[PDB]
């Protein structure tokens, strides 16, 4: 993901997520600091893993 | 799923619901609560291994 406005509000109001965990950064202070690229890695696994 | 490694020559037939997280299950089999007795996918078309 590159060359766009990185709004995270969609990930905030959406209460159907079973897990939203953040590492190294705050789950809410993401909009303040920004970088070159955003990578989205999407796949399907089982709940046990 | 099991809390501790089995002592040699010990059989455990208990089918209690496993608590993987921190919320006790009390036998509900839901989120973060699993049934340890997994079945086997045995079909003639499987590979040798």
């Amino acid at each position: 993901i590159s060359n766009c406005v990185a709004d995270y509000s969609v990930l905030y109001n959406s209460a159907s997520f079973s897990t939203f965990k953040c590492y190294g950064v705050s789950p809410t202070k993401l909009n303040d600091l920004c970088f070159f690229n955003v990578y989205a890695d999407s796949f399907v696994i089982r709940g046990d893993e | 799923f099991r809390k501790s490694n089995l002592k040699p020559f010990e059989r455990d037939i208990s089918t209690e619901i496993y608590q993987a997280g921190s919320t006790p299950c009390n036998g509900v089999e839901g989120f973060n609560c699993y049934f340890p007795l997994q079945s086997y996918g045995f079909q003639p078309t499987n590979g040798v291994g």
Partner: nanobody
Amino acid sequence: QLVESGGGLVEAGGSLRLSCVASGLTFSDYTMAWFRQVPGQEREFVSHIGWGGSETYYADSVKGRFTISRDNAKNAMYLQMNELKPDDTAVYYCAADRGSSFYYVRESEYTFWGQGVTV
């Protein structure tokens, strides 16, 4: 895994200090929380602290009363009470996790859990 201290009978208005010590975690890249247990009812959330202590939240029924803090020099964090209402007498549980979650109120978002404080 998570050994905790503190707790006891209080004078219903004084102050108390609770601690939770990690014995097998680095404690420098982990985020903890405080949860409350009441018999006959579900598990309640009270307090939460991020890495270092620069981003902390509190419950709507406890905001403004209790203070949270952490210190890496001993692999432990300190929770201090200031009101101790005769309604908050309950069972105290110390949680921890690698990261911080948006659904930080959910109990399922804390893989690690400690022992219990005196009811």
